Ligand binder design. Structure first.
Ligand code: CLA
Ligand code: CLA
Ligand code: CLA
Ligand code: CLA
Ligand code: CLA
Ligand code: CLA
Ligand code: CLA
Ligand code: CLA
Ligand SMILES: CC1=C(/C=C/C(C)=C/C=C/C(C)=C/C=C/C=C(C)/C=C/C=C(C)/C=C/C2=C(C)CCCC2(C)C)C(C)(C)CCC1
Ligand SMILES: CC1=C(/C=C/C(C)=C/C=C/C(C)=C/C=C/C=C(C)/C=C/C=C(C)/C=C/C2=C(C)CCCC2(C)C)C(C)(C)CCC1
Ligand SMILES: CC1=C(C/C=C(\C)CCC[C@H](C)CCC[C@H](C)CCCC(C)C)C(=O)c2ccccc2C1=O
Lengths: 68, 80, 732, 61, 165, 39, 107, 37
């Protein structure tokens, strides 16, 4: 199998989907300290969305490894 | 010593006073009821907490209340 | 006046013997001490929880030490079917030589006790093989107990006292506990299983010597970081595997097979490994939910303010409940005790039917002891949950900070609650008692064919839904053409089906009309105990007989003989009355459990099926019949090893009976008797030179209820434990 | 306040006859705090059938 | 059949229990005279025993592994397999007579509250009014659902409650 | 005679008569219809 | 006493079913029941029962079936009296059934 | 080197059965009855 492609693609997909379409909703519901990203997408946002990306990627890899 | 309180619903029927087996309560002048009499508890150090006063009171709810507090030799009714 | 107790000067100025008992009974009620503030309250609670931790680890280290020095653990592991586990040796100088001969059972030097606590199966399953491992564990846990005792001393010191803001920080505590204390501990236990406990069952020693040189899997961490996780499930243990050796062994460390190991009749170690790994990942994910000092996370008060439905069916919803859970400790203790009691019932219900440890469920006395132990623990903890809920209503409930939410609306319809609990209790009592008395009259008059035997078709429908092919419903796991049957068939169903269609285990036992009647008696006991406990929680603020009940507190004797008489009117007295029903209900569930398992273990389940539908069959075939070898423990012909359980059986009957004295006879008789005794001592010459320092009085009313319930419960527990252990160990 | 013989309804929540109906006996016209004398057909736990109430504790319903 | 239960007319332990009870009765019978009163009483007992076993095997009851009749309490399963006469028809018969008793008592209470001595009618029963309500209470489910639909079945919140309601 | 029927109208006398009637009705039903378990 | 008297001699009462002594078994169980039933009165107090009756009275008020004679919990002394009476009846009747079944069967 | 010797029950059981209960009950009885200054 291709572990690097699945993990990097899932991480890129979840980081992009949290960077662009779920940023403003997460800011509305919430209402380290400063980055120079223009949307305030700081380190802990990277950590959360990359954690979800690695989790879904390893879930896909495990379900593929069972072949089921 | 126990805690005995008198509330303003008292109608000065004197029933509580004549029910205490220890002479703790007494009637004082007052202007809040037609009888111009109110109970008072100046000697709660001798009160045992038998609650005969609460049984004798006619008002609903009670105008005399006994809250069992810290025990002494007088409040435990000990003759020894 | 006197010093003791140092927390209450109202008790310290008591000239009577009431001072000693009320200093003992009020020592740990810190909220009502002299000069108690809120920070001081939380600090003493934190140190007390350290003290409980140290006592728990010292208890476990003592179990390990007495097994390692006095047990037969290195001899038990070779033949665990025919060798009895030894708890601890007996040094009783009151013995005689027949007792020393009879308690020297085998294989021991002197008199020993045979353990029923089941620690040999648990320790042998998790990898213990020698006594030296148990000595190392005992020394390690004594060291951990000393560390927790020192930490309890340490966090009271003024440079180490936490602030009030540290205790009321709910999000940090749930995040750290759900992540660390649950998930990291379950992950580390998966690490223990994979690294030690699975290779010990394969016949390979893995200790602290060689665990950094023994691979748990022949390809270490390459399937884990490749994502080829199905490689760790390849080649599991064969169905002809001898536990603790390499014959019939496998290579896998994380399977999901279902059912039981064929020899030990217990769960697979790889299944428990992937169990703890899955829930470890789930708890570490769940512990990243709440908002600490990192910007992301949920805010619990915002969650509580959100969940309020339209149309006002819950009123203000969950508004204002964050300042009633976080500010109150009795609310938190009530939630904790409700959860822990239900989980303890869950532990008992899932450990009798799905036994986890190797050669458990062939040691029948261990099964009966563990089930009965955790069921009575769960019953006491549930009564404590409702008791501290009533204490919450009396002390901590602010009605202005709860104007319109769910908790005030419970007090608004409390009469409908208590009335419908009264209705289900009366219904279940009338019809369960009527069916039992009917069947007893049919058995007495010689016609068993007339007796009302209702078939439990709903729980049998559930058993057919789980895969049991005895009742012929054939749906969802019992039919071969089902979607759930076909989807689960490759992976976990072939073990579950083989284990559920066996009638030699406790996994989904065959049920019938006796099981019907007893489950409705159990529902009766639960709904009645819930009626008394809920009625004590809700009428704690006051009733119509006593509207100002919140002004007296939680535990006051009565309000006197006026207004018709008000005896047992406090919420404490409702707890007192509900402990009897808790003991009753757990007695019903343990009589039922024990007798159905005795008829399973003997072979004749037809005896239970024929005799459990009428109460004379209970009294004749479970209590009279299974107490023959118990009461023959000692006799005028000699004694044997069951004489200690016969003495404990009579001991429990005696303590029970002595508690009846405090429950029936009340105070003023005894106070007049003690006044005559005071006269008799002060007038007797040459003994009145000795004089008491504390004035003797009788026990108080609340103290009488507590002492009577205490003797009652201790005699109840000792009587049933003596009967259960003696019957199950003597006849097997 | 209310007149003699009229039916009233009690709003004192710690009373036995709260949310129930009685009959006014007399209303004292002095500066007494609880002038409204109401009899009830059923007795309380103390065997009493008469209580004194204030003006804002009775509603002629 | 249902839950692996055999019918009682097919069950063997049912016939064994029938034979065992007849054997006990004839062992008690064989120590008397022919035309004596204990003999007539025991022969009537044996006749009722045979009639009872024939009636239980006739009604289609389900027996277990011990030969005793088992009852089925599920409306659809019993209506499907012909077991409606053991729980379902008895539960609606009970609800008819229990609601009869409750409705007659409720009408007696509302009839006697409108007098100058309701308690005196509660101690000493008005027998003609009680018999009138007892005969009129046969249409209690119709009158019950009519009092339900008008809002006169319930008292409003003029009930007695505690200070925290 | 009016007072004797008033005494017969009292609660324990009517409870005795009514439970005698109800018990006797059940007894006669269980005599003429011996041992009903179904229907 | 527990084994050779009570346990041993209750054989006759516990196996009296299906014979003419079955009534002694029924009254054995019934007497045990009544004895236990007394403990509810002996161990409790009328305040709890009065409040329970308050809730039930509310339920009856909701359906217009509250009696004109007000439901009251038993008095303290009547609770004690009911307790001791059911206690005595239960125990004595238990020993009655035991004795009679025993001595009629082995006599 | 963990095993306590063979005479250890004959000393430790009467110790915590008689001597430490006696010292404990005596110290607690003196602590209960002590007058406050
Ligand atoms: C889990 C077991 C446990 C723990 C952690 C505690 C902890 C405590 N006890 Mg308690 N206590 C216990 C069991 C326990 N007790 C038992 C079994 C009894 C006999 C019924 C008592 C009776 C008792 C009394 C009489 C007193 C304490 C006091 C205390 C506190 C002071 C510690 C000290 O060394 O003095 C501490 C919170 C003392 C205190 O000052 O509390 C405020 C105190 O006076 N305890
Ligand atoms: C949680 C407790 C725990 C601990 C302390 C260990 C520790 C160890 N394991 Mg074990 N193991 C565990 C759980 C644990 N494991 C679980 C849950 C499984 C089942 C998946 C295994 C299955 C397993 C196998 C098959 C092997 C090990 C091996 C090892 C050793 C080297 C690991 C390594 O080089 O990682 C790499 C180092 C890192 C720093 C990367 C880990 C960072 C993590 C994933 C992220 C942060 C969290 C080390 C002693 C190996 C060994 O050498 O045995 C002697 C080996 O072959 N483990
Ligand atoms: C989970 C932990 C937990 C904690 C931290 C607490 C804490 C508290 N409880 Mg709660 N409670 C709990 C669980 C807990 N409880 C459980 C499991 C129950 C059910 C039993 C209760 C039921 C309960 C009631 C009814 C009350 C409390 C009260 C209290 C408070 C004071 C306790 C005290 O000072 O009495 C000191 C305790 C004793 C002196 C115990 C006496 C010994 C008992 C009766 C057992 C005797 C059996 C004996 C050991 C057997 C020996 C046999 C022999 C042959 C060897 C304190 C806040 C009281 C309160 O809050 O008042 C307002 C109170 O009234 N609790
Ligand atoms: C075996 C003894 C025993 C029995 C039968 C009961 C029965 C009951 N308890 Mg009690 N209880 C007991 C022991 C017992 N308790 C003890 C030891 C205590 C500790 C003090 C308590 C404390 C207690 C509390 C705190 C509460 C109860 C409640 C109840 C009632 C529960 C509802 C129900 O099941 O109705 C079914 C009815 C029965 C099982 C009773 C039998 C009724 C018979 C069948 C009817 C009459 C038959 C016959 C015609 C009579 C002829 C007699 C002749 C002289 C005329 C029920 C009456 C609760 C309650 O009131 O709920 C509504 C409640 O809150 N009990
Ligand atoms: C007290 C709760 C209760 C429970 C646990 C059951 C249990 C059962 N019902 Mg019964 N039933 C009940 C009360 C109950 N019933 C009541 C009050 C009625 C009158 C409305 C019925 C009327 C009824 C009919 C007409 C039928 C059942 C059937 C069944 C069986 C399968 C139902 C199913 O799979 O759906 C899941 C279970 C539930 C949702 C519980 C409620 C049951 C509802 C009321 C009926 C469900 C019928 C179901 C949709 C039809 C399945 C067809 C079958 C061939 C697969 C199951 C043993 C069926 C049967 O005979 O199977 C052999 C069937 O045909 N029931
Ligand atoms: C007179 C009719 C009558 C009616 C309609 C009701 C109705 C009710 N009762 Mg009440 N009750 C009654 C009399 C009645 N009761 C009597 C006589 C007693 C014993 C003193 C009780 C004691 C009682 C308790 C302890 C409880 C109820 C409860 C209830 C409710 C649930 C149904 C139930 O479980 O009853 C069950 C029936 C009984 C427990 C006893 C009934 C006895 C007989 C059969 C009825 C009386 C017949 C009457 C004398 C006939 C006179 C008519 C004639 C003069 C013309 C329901 C509102 C329960 C509740 O509150 O749930 C919401 C509940 O827990 N009742
Ligand atoms: C509360 C639970 C309960 C239930 C559900 C039953 C039910 C039954 N019992 Mg049992 N029994 C019980 C408690 C119960 N009993 C108790 C507590 C005792 C000891 C006192 C007995 C002792 C007993 C004996 C000795 C006998 C029974 C019998 C019966 C059957 C009688 C049928 C009948 O009366 O004809 C039908 C009734 C009527 C037609 C009267 C109702 C009138 C209305 C108007 C009919 C309306 C219908 C529409 C019925 C199945 C008899 C039997 O043979 O069982 C198989 C029988 O001989 N019972
Ligand atoms: C904490 C749980 C625990 C329990 C219930 C027991 C129980 C027993 N021990 Mg064991 N013991 C334990 C832990 C325990 N032990 C540990 C961890 C060790 C290693 C240090 C020992 C070392 C030991 C020896 C050498 C012997 C026993 C013996 C015994 C038996 C006789 C009682 C005795 O004299 O012990 C005395 C207890 C000790 C010597 C050690 C306990 C020391 C701890 C620190 C005490 C803790 C204090 C406690 C929490 C509160 C006390 C004060 C309070 C009561 C007011 C009895 C079965 C005797 C025996 O085997 O008879 C056949 C015996 O000879 N024990
Ligand atoms: C700067 C910039 C940029 C770039 C960016 C990037 C490139 C980023 C990345 C980032 C990243 C790349 C991140 C990551 C993250 C990750 C993480 C944070 C992870 C975590 C993990 C986890 C958490 C895991 C876990 C686990 C384990 C350990 C075991 C198994 C199970 C699981 C899977 C669960 C751009 C160009 C756009 C633009 C310009 C600016
Ligand atoms: C008094 C009080 C209190 C207490 C209370 C209590 C004590 C309670 C208890 C409670 C409880 C004790 C509860 C329980 C619960 C449980 C539940 C509710 C469960 C459920 C379950 C489920 C839902 C499941 C299901 C299932 C099945 C069966 C199978 C299939 C699958 C599933 C999983 C789905 C408090 C603290 C609040 C405070 C106030 C006062
Ligand atoms: C259970 C119990 C009660 C409740 C018991 C009560 C209220 C007695 C109920 C007796 C009957 C059931 C009520 C009266 C029935 C009437 C004759 C109504 C007619 C019913 C027809 C079926 C005849 C107490 O009042 C009490 C008081 C003091 C200490 C202990 C206890 C106690 O244990």
């Amino acid at each position: 199998l291709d572990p690097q492609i699945v993990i990097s693609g899932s991480t890129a997909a979840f980081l992009a989907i949290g960077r662009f379409v779920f940023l403003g909703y997460q800011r509305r519901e919430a209402n380290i300290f400063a980055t120079n990203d223009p949307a305030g997408f700081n380190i802990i946002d990277v950590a959360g969305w990359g954690a979800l990306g690695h989790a879904v990627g390893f879930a896909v890899l495990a379900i593929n490894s069972l072949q089921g | 010593a126990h805690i005995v309180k008198i509330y303003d619903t008292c109608i000065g029927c004197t029933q509580c006073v004549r029910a205490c087996p220890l002479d703790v309560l007494e009637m004082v002048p007052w202007d809040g009821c037609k009888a111009s009499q109110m109970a008072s508890a100046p000697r709660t150090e001798d009160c045992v907490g038998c609650k005969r006063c609460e049984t004798a009171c006619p008002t609903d709810f009670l105008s005399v209340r006994v809250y069992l507090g810290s025990e002494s030799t007088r409040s435990m009714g000990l003759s020894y | 006046h006197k010093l003791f107790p140092k927390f209450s000067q109202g008790l310290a100025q008591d000239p009577t013997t009431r001072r000693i008992w009320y200093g003992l009974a009020m020592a740990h009620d810190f909220e009502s001490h002299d000069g108690m503030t809120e920070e001081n309250l939380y600090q003493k609670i934190f140190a007390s929880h350290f003290g409980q931790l140290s006592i728990i680890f010292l208890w476990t280290s003592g179990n390990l030490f007495h097994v390692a020095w006095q047990g037969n653990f290195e001899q038990w592991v070779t033949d665990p079917v025919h060798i009895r586990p030894i708890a601890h040796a007996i040094w009783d100088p009151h013995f005689g030589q027949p007792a020393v001969e009879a308690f020297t059972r085998g294989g021991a030097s002197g008199p020993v006790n045979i353990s029923t606590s089941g620690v040999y199966q648990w320790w042998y399953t998790i990898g213990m093989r020698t006594n030296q491992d148990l000595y190392v564990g005992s020394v390690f846990l004594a060291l951990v107990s000393a560390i927790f005792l020192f930490a309890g001393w340490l966090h009271l010191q003024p440079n180490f006292q936490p602030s009030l803001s540290w205790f009321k920080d709910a999000e940090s505590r749930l995040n750290h506990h759900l992540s660390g204390l649950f998930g990291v501990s379950s992950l580390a236990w998966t690490g223990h299983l994979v690294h030690v406990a699975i290779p010990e069952s394969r016949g390979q020693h893995v200790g602290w010597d060689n665990f950094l040189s023994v691979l748990p899997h022949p390809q270490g961490l390459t399937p884990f970081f490749t994502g080829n996780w199905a490689a760790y499930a390849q080649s599991p243990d064969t169905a002809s595997h001898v536990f603790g050796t390499a014959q019939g062994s496998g290579q896998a460390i994380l399977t999901f097979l279902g059912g039981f190991h064929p020899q030990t009749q217990s769960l697979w170690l790889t299944d428990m490994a992937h169990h703890h790994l899955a829930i470890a990942v789930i708890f570490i994910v769940a512990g990243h939910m709440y908002r600490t000092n990192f910007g992301i996370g949920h805010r619990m008060q915002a969650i509580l303010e959100a969940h309020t439905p339209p149309s006002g069916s819950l009123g203000a919803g969950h508004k204002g409940l964050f300042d009633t859970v976080n500010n109150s400790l009795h609310f938190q203790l009530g939630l904790a005790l409700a959860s822990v009691g239900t989980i303890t019932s869950l532990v008992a219900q899932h450990m009798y039917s799905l036994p986890p440890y190797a050669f458990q469920a062939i040691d029948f006395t261990t099964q009966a002891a563990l089930y009965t132990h955790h069921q009575y623990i769960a019953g006491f903890i549930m009564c404590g949950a409702f008791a501290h809920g009533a204490i919450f209503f009396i002390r901590d409930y602010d009605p202005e900070q709860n104007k319109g939410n769910v908790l005030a609306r419970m007090l608004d319809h409390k009469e409908a609650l208590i009335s419908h609990l009264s209705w289900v209790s009366l219904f279940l009592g009338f019809h369960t008692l009527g069916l039992y008395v009917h069947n007893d009259v049919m058995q007495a008059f010689g016609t068993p064919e007339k007796q009302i035997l209702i078939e439990p078709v709903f729980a049998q429908w559930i058993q057919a839904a789980h895969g049991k092919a005895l009742y012929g419903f054939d749906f969802l796991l019992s039919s071969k053409t089902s979607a759930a049957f076909a989807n689960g068939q490759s992976l976990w169903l072939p073990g579950w089906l083989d284990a559920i269609n066996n009638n030699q285990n406790s996994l989904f036992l065959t049920i019938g009309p006796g099981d019907f009647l007893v489950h409705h008696a159990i529902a009766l006991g639960l709904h009645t105990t819930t009626l008394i406990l809920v009625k004590g929680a809700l009428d704690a603020r006051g009733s119509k007989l006593m509207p100002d009940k919140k002004d007296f507190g939680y535990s006051f004797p009565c309000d006197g003989p006026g207004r018709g008489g008000t005896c047992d009117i406090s919420a404490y007295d409702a707890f007192y009355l509900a402990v009897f029903w808790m003991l009753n209900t757990i007695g019903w569930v343990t009589f039922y459990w024990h007798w159905k398992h005795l008829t399973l273990w003997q072979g004749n389940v037809a005896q239970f099926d024929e005799s459990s539908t009428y109460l004379m069959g209970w009294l004749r075939d479970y209590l009279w019949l299974n107490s023959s070898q118990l009461i023959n423990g000692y006799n005028p012909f000699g004694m044997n090893s069951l004489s200690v359980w016969a003495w404990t059986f009579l001991f429990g009957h005696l303590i029970y009976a002595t508690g009846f004295m405090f429950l029936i006879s009340w105070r003023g008789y005894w106070q007049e008797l003690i006044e005559t005794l005071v006269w008799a001592h002060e007038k007797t010459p040459l003994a009145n030179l000795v004089y008491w320092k504390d004035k003797p009085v009788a026990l108080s009313i609340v103290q009488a209820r507590l002492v009577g319930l205490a003797h009652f419960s201790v005699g109840y527990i000792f009587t049933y434990a003596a009967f259960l252990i003696a019957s199950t160990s003597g006849r097997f | 306040g209310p007149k003699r013989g009229s039916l009233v309804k009690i709003l004192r929540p710690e009373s036995y006859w709260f949310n129930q109906v009685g009959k006014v006996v007399s209303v004292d016209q002095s500066g007494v705090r609880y002038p409204v004398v109401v009899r009830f057909e059923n007795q309380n736990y103390a065997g009493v059938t008469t209580n004194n109430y204030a003006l804002d504790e009775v509603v002629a319903a | 059949d249902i839950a692996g239960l055999t019918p009682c007319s097919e069950s063997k332990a049912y016939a064994k229990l029938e034979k065992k009870e007849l054997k006990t009765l004839e062992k008690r019978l064989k120590q008397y005279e022919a035309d004596s009163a204990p003999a007539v009483a025991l022969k009537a007992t044996m006749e009722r025993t045979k009639a009872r076993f024939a009636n239980y095997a006739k009604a289609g009851l389900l027996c277990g592994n011990d030969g005793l009749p088992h009852l089925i309490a599920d409306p659809g399963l019993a209506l499907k397999y012909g077991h409606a006469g053991e729980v379902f028809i008895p539960t609606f018969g009970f609800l008819y007579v229990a609601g009869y008793i409750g409705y007659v008592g409720r009408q007696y209470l509302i009839a006697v509250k409108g007098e100058a001595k309701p308690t005196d009618k509660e101690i000493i029963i008005d027998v003609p009014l009680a018999t009138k309500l007892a005969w009129q209470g046969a249409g209690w489910p119709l009158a019950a659902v009519q009092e339900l639909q008008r809002g006169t079945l319930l008292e409003k919140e003029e009930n007695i409650t505690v200070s925290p309601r | 005679m009016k007072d004797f029927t008033t005494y017969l109208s009292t609660a324990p006398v009517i409870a005795t008569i009514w439970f005698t009637f109800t018990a006797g009705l059940l007894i006669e039903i269980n005599r003429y219809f011996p041992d009903p378990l179904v229907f | 006493w527990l084994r050779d008297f009570l346990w041993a001699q209750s054989s006759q009462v516990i196996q009296s079913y299906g014979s003419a002594l079955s009534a002694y078994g029924l009254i054995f169980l019934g007497a045990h029941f009544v004895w236990a039933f007394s403990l509810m009165f002996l161990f409790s107090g009328r305040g709890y029962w009065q409040e329970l009756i308050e809730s039930i009275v509310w339920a009856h008020n909701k359906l217009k079936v509250a009696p004109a004679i007000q439901p009251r919990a038993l008095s303290i002394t009547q609770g004690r009296a009911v307790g001791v009476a059911h206690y005595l009846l239960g125990g004595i009747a238990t020993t009655w059934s035991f004795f009679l079944a025993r001595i009629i069967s082995v006599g | 080197p963990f095993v306590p010797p063979s005479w250890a029950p004959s000393v430790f059981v009467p110790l915590t059965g008689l001597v430490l209960p006696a010292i404990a009950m005596a110290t607690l009885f003196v602590y209960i009855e002590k007058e406050a200054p």
